[PDB]
Design a protein around this ligand. Sequence first.
Ligand SMILES: [Cl-]
Ligand SMILES: [Cl-]
Ligand code: NA
Length: 129
Amino acid sequence: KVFGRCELAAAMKRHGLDNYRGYSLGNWVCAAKFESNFNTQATNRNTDGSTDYGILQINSRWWCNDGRTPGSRNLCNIPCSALLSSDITASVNCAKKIVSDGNGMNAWVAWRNRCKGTDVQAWIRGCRL
Ligand SMILES: [Cl-]
Ligand SMILES: [Cl-]
Ligand code: NA
């Protein structure tokens, strides 16, 4: 599913991401824009052999199981394919764990390089939220 911007904002907010670990909704929408272009089916192989999955490009080295990432953990206890669903519940639950791991949203390299410190509230402008 390719979410609309405000459609994703509303779903993230309903699932409790607004101000989760202090990160406003716009941070999460901005991260999803640059990780996946709002496409739940996005997958991208990393140089270390792991793969990033879904709307927030959650990686198979630590967080989900894809059966092809040696030495990997599955700390969200989820097949990585569950992070490609049109329902973002699994991705949100896993993202809550990732953002609680110690470095906040810097865990998402695209958030650090493209969203951090910017006017992230622009990403929810116009949304009836
Ligand atoms: Cl915001
Ligand atoms: Cl933080
Ligand atoms: Na894994």
